[PDB]
């Protein structure tokens, strides 16, 4: 107990009953800092902000070093941020940060499973949703799933090898590191204490018979080159890169050293997604869009975000994904092989295919997000 232990490594200790109560409590974060002349926890509780304990100054330098060994970090560094991840199930994310009286942490806190959503629960649209199902099914060739960091990349991958997740399947994973098992699905992680890194365990992989084959992700040439090699040999492949387009991600396979004409013929479709918060249905508001936001799309009804209890900041709750599926077909194998670039590209996809921008505004549309958070992302 937290409370009691407050009241009396004991710090190891502490920081563990400090994080068992948070659960508890049902809390999204913890805070410990620094004042000049004390220190102070604070825990958040459904938007709410409290104190919870405000313990002597002086351990200050104890309880950033222990957060830091648990989330693997740099004891020795002080004067730049530093970011981090612990596995308790808890998702632990931990935030440290350059304060004029010592470093500020946050423990972030997330429930492993609310992360776990089956391919229908992405809120992919309609013909999105369709042409995905079909391009997984694929006997061989390359799916990648692009975005920048917190796309959630790793939530549609999973959903989708579960979407093939049947015993005429051999699929095999190799990940840095594995989120969570899913059972049918032989899933590998790499380690550095035995040089298993992406490169080594997909060639592994290889000799494994597989039907279908997960790489977390393509980050350097090599790990790239046995991905094609994969993918042309009879394997689908499906991976992430964190480019912000569709078409980028052509553009980031050569920029690594892929041969044009092997991305031309490995590459099956590139699913580029954004997450987009779902607003919350009880404090929305509607308005009428004046003209300035109909040039964007009778009165044209959208909705706004306000701010409620049942959302805390902000007016939201939940999210979801809005996607571009660029799909290859013969026209853009010789747009990929000639190198004809983005623009080139992106035109020949537009014919079929709308842009993330798009799909984002028909939600807006719909009335599940608003404006503001479909625009700030592009
Ligand atoms: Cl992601
Ligand atoms: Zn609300």
Same mark, same amino acid.
């Given at each position: 107990?937290? /409370?009691?232990?407050?009241?009396?490594?004991?710090?190891? $200790?502490?920081?563990?009953?400090?994080?068992?109560? %948070?659960?508890?409590?049902? *809390?999204?974060?913890?805070?410990?800092? @620094?004042?000049? $002349?004390?220190?102070?926890?604070? /825990? =958040?509780?459904?938007?709410?902000?409290?104190?919870?304990? %405000?313990?002597?100054?002086?351990?200050?330098?104890?309880?950033?070093?222990?957060? $830091?060994?648990?989330?693997?970090?740099?004891?020795?560094?002080?004067?730049? !941020?530093?970011? &981090? =991840?612990?596995?308790?199930?808890?998702?632990?994310?931990?935030?440290?940060?350059?304060?004029?009286?010592?470093?500020?942490?946050?423990?972030?806190?997330?429930?492993?499973?609310?992360? =776990?959503?089956?391919? #229908?629960?992405?809120?992919?649209? *309609?013909?999105?949703?369709?042409?995905?199902?079909?391009?997984?099914?694929?006997? #061989?060739?390359?799916?990648?799933?692009?975005?920048?960091? &917190?796309?959630?990349?790793?939530?549609?991958?999973?959903?989708?090898?579960?979407?093939?997740?049947?015993?005429?399947?051999?699929?095999?994973?190799?990940?840095?590191?594995?989120? /969570?098992?899913?059972?049918?699905?032989?899933?590998?992680?790499?380690?550095?204490?035995?040089?298993?890194?992406?490169?080594?365990?997909?060639? *592994?992989?290889?000799?494994?018979? !597989?039907?279908?084959?997960?790489? &977390?992700?393509?980050?350097?040439?090599?790990?790239?080159?046995?991905?094609?090699?994969?993918?042309?040999?009879? #394997?689908?492949?499906?991976?992430?890169?964190?480019?912000?387009?569709?078409?980028? %991600?052509?553009?980031?396979? =050569?920029?690594? &050293?892929?041969?044009?004409?092997?991305?031309?013929?490995?590459?099956?479709?590139?699913? %580029?997604?954004?997450?987009?918060? @779902?607003?919350?249905?009880?404090?929305?508001?509607?308005?009428?869009?004046?003209?300035?936001?109909?040039?964007?799309?009778?009165?044209?009804?959208?909705?706004?975000?306000?701010?409620? !209890?049942?959302?805390?900041?902000?007016?939201?709750?939940?999210?979801?994904?809005?996607?571009?599926?660029?799909?290859?077909?013969?026209?853009?194998?010789?747009?990929?092989?000639?190198?004809?670039?983005?623009?080139?590209?992106?035109?020949?996809?537009?014919?079929? @295919?709308?842009?993330?921008?798009?799909?984002?505004?028909?939600?807006?549309?719909?009335?599940?997000?608003?404006?503001?958070?479909?625009?700030?992302?592009?």
């Amino acid at each position: 107990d937290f /409370f009691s232990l407050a009241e009396e490594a004991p710090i190891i $200790k502490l920081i563990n009953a400090m994080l068992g109560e %948070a659960i508890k409590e049902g *809390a999204s974060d913890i805070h410990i800092e @620094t004042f000049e $002349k004390t220190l102070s926890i604070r /825990f =958040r509780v459904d938007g709410v902000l409290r104190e919870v304990l %405000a313990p002597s100054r002086k351990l200050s330098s104890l309880l950033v070093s222990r957060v $830091k060994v648990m989330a693997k970090l740099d004891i020795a560094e002080k004067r730049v !941020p530093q970011d &981090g =991840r612990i596995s308790l199930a808890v998702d632990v994310r931990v935030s440290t940060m350059p304060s004029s009286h010592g470093e500020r942490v946050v423990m972030r806190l997330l429930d492993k499973n609310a992360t =776990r959503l089956d391919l #229908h629960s992405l809120g992919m649209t *309609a013909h999105n949703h369709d042409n995905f199902r079909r391009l997984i099914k694929r006997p #061989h060739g390359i799916i990648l799933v692009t975005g920048p960091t &917190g796309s959630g990349k790793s939530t549609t991958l999973y959903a989708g090898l579960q979407e093939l997740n049947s015993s005429e399947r051999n699929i095999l994973t190799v990940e840095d590191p594995i989120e /969570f098992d899913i059972d049918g699905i032989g899933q590998t992680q790499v380690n550095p204490r035995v040089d298993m890194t992406f490169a080594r365990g997909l060639r *592994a992989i290889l000799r494994q018979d !597989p039907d279908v084959v997960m790489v &977390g992700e393509i980050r350097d040439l090599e790990t790239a080159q046995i991905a094609v090699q994969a993918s042309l040999t009879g #394997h689908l492949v499906m991976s992430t890169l964190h480019t912000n387009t569709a078409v980028g %991600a052509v553009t980031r396979l =050569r920029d690594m &050293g892929i041969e044009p004409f092997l991305i031309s013929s490995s590459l099956l479709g590139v699913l %580029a997604q954004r997450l987009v918060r @779902t607003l919350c249905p009880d404090c929305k508001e509607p308005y009428e869009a004046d003209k300035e936001q109909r040039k964007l799309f009778e009165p044209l009804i959208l909705y706004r975000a306000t701010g409620c !209890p049942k959302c805390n900041h902000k007016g939201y709750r939940g999210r979801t994904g809005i996607h571009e599926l660029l799909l290859v077909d013969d026209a853009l194998q010789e747009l990929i092989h000639s190198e004809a670039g983005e623009q080139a590209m992106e035109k020949h996809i537009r014919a079929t @295919t709308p842009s993330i921008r798009d799909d984002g505004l028909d939600k807006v549309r719909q009335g599940i997000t608003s404006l503001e958070e479909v625009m700030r992302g592009s």
